[PDB]
Design a protein around this nucleic acid. Sequence first.
RNA 1: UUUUUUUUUUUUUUU
RNA 2: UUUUUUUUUUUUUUUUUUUUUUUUU
Lengths: 50, 624, 184, 140, 18
Amino acid sequence: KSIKKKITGTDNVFRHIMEESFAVLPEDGPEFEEDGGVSAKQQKSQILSE
Amino acid sequence: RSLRQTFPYVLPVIRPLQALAALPVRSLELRSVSVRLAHAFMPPFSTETEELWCAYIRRLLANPVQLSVDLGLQIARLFASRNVVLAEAWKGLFASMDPLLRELRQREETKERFPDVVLKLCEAANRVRHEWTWGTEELMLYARRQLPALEAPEAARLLHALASSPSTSESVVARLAEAFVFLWERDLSGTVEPAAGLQLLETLARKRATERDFIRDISRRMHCYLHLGLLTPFEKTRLAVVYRQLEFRHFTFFRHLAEELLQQNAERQRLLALGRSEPSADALQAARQHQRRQRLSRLQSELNPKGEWRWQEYLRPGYVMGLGLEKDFSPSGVILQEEILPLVTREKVAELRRGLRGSPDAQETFPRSEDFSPCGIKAFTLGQTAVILDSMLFLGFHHQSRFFGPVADVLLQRATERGAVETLDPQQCTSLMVFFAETRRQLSEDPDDCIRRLTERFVDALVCEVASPAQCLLFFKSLVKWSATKSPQPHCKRKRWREWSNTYRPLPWLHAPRPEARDTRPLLLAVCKQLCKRVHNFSMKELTGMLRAIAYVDFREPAFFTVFVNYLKERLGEMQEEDIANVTQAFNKAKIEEPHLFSLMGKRYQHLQANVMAVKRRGVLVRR
Amino acid sequence: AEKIFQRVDPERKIAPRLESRGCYIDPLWDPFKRVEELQQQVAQDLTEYAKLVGAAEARRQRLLVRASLRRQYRMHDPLSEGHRRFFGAQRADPFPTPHRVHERFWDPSPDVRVALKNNNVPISWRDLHILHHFVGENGLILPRRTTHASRYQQRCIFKAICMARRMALFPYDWKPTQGELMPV
Amino acid sequence: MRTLGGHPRRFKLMGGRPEFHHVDRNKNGHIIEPTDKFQVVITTSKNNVHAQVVNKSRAYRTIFGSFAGNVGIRKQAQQGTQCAYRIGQNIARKCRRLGISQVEIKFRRIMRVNQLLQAFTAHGLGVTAIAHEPRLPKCG
Amino acid sequence: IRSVLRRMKAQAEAAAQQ
RNA sequence: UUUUUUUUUUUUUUU
RNA sequence: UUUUUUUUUUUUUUUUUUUUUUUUU
């Protein structure tokens, strides 16, 4: 909304969490894991070694 | 050039006391000391030195123009070293080389054809913001045919040139970039340095791209050098500039710079209480400026045993506007400042974190080209602080009252200091003005004197034609914003009702003359005179903003606005939607009622708005 | 084949789930094994990098292979629309199915079928993210022949949407916006 | 005899003034600015039909309008199809005089809305969007 | 892709050997 | 002029 | 007091007191 009549007097909470989260995981770090989710993890449990 | 009572320089016409040795009706052996001695003996080109002509009132070269095989690059380089803005310089040169360059395809079917004549000439021309259609086509075409052949080093440089060519299409350029990246992804991942790394990102910054994946990798390596304490101040500032165009909102990086300024101010003040006062960065930068002038004078005297030279440093080769001079900096950082904040991450380390939670691979090496230890300047300069700060503002960092507070205070302290606004490139001056206007209600003392001094120098630089249209557009657009306060005056009908209005602060230092200075014209008329003289060089987006700003200082000159009526009518189709809104305001404010132009502008605005649907109490529903 | 494959799992959309082949194909009898062997061969076969012509021409040829694979990326999905585009075949002409059907036969869409159950929880006024589907452009209540829902839940749904409007938590003549799709 | 396609009552008050003389202007004195949006609201009926121009850039301010009596059609002739067609032509012709190109169309009924739409496209007045907001009763 | 690659490889060797 | 009728009138507005 | 219509170097900018009171351009 362009009009300056919406919710203004409020505190941002989303950013707070994110800001504090950089300690455990830097921004330059990876965005995804090799293990993946449940779909990916199931694959690794079925494939066999040489 | 018969008049010689005001320019006692070497080589009056061609020879000290001769004219081409009075040759009859070949012209290289007896004139090779013309260009050689003209490299450091002519003041920079400007309005007060119109006698400085590249062709010397059509006497040199030209009467067919030939014999330019040798002095091809030397001549070109000269022009670029003094910012010439004369039209009858380029057209003549290009034409002259028609038979010399097209004839070099002997071995293609002795220097080298592309990298030693086309690539070198283009570079020179580019710096001058000149139009070269012929060079664009020839270089673009060649790139498209032998892309894979070229090595990494050659690709990097080639791409740079292209990117720096607005004439070139944006769609075509982008496509080519993908090939380069794909071919060179692994090689260029660990065996890179900051010096060469920045070059790569510049391509992606001046042109639209979607290679986000590739960008992240580069940034990762760069941050490694920052934590190790190896990035020079020059590089540190350079990194921030590109970030603004890419809209890279990095928290951990910006915070580091924010705190770096704090420590610089704190440490200086601490030492002032005991007696020992270390020299400031501002003075150090200017200290070496006098040395460069001293050696130049002695060189001329030695070479010839028997004011105008104001802006002679910014035009030198290798000087990057907005940052400084490359060979004027030394490495510094964690070794001399905070060691804690930016989170280092390497290729090896990144892999580990990729898995579960709860040196041989990567090797950083900066010193490869030349030793960076001239015992020069350290830390950041006065002007370097402003450039970096602008980026933050753009991104919207000032919103967060965490770190921008203290930072802003630091700058203001030094800003209002006596003799602190006279040693800085014009590029930096534009950024400094934006910081004051961006935060009007968050300043300790109103810097009214700072604006007056800054404005005086901005007109001086524009008259010499040493600033691009885009860099000259921020100062003026932002000036009106600073001198404007929003109030809620009572309504005309009902006094209890209120309506928000705008009130502009009067200016009493822009209309008066300056008899003390050589230029008796005021600061306001000087800007207008240059704008109308070089209207063609400005684009449509760069023209309405400058005109909209002149009318905001109560400029009741209907004749000034009546010159552009014929120019705008013939270029109405090339006008954007923003351009319409930025031009009507100007005429109405000055009480210039024009029906033949306003009637036509109504149709253009409605035609652009033919694809946007907006309803009531809901907003825009369907767009395009 | 496309329609018969929806009865086995009406709560999900058909897709090539290559990552879950173990539950349907024995690891030893996996036909994908061939790929591993084949992929290694192509890399090994590129001995021309520098043997005969050098790296000069090697690079050029590399681009060729990338293009080929990208073009043919749609070849691995016959049931997909990509297959038809490649071969250039005319569209199908299914028999005209009457709109008016007995209540015994009904094939609700997978997307709306899962929302109806709501994890075996009756829909109430708090479920704002589910009532947005049971409303037309003008904001009127859809009939039982369109939403494809049972008689008992049809009356409950009408009550939840009606109450939400009284509380100023739902539009009255248009569909909700993206900023109001959240439960209470 | 001496038929004229206009309003006889207004014609008697003529005194040589130019067009758009009694219409109020803005502070700047310009009758219309290049940046503006219009939305004609058309209302149909059994005998007569009205269509006024509404400017969205001036807090929904009316500029001018027309009716069956402003084109020289009276008596039962208004019920004919020509009455709607003639009214549309006058609006389209007058639109070019002011300097408007794109004007939206809005109506509540669909009975006499066919002649007006056809006439607009025969002069140059295009259509950007069509709005229909029938205020149907929600109670018995 | 393999077929073409192999074939191409042999063509260069024959010409180079002469 | 507006409203209304197959058509028309009565009625209403007044720079 | 109520806000109407837009853009993207920013949280920015224009308008503002109830309308309408004529065909061919």
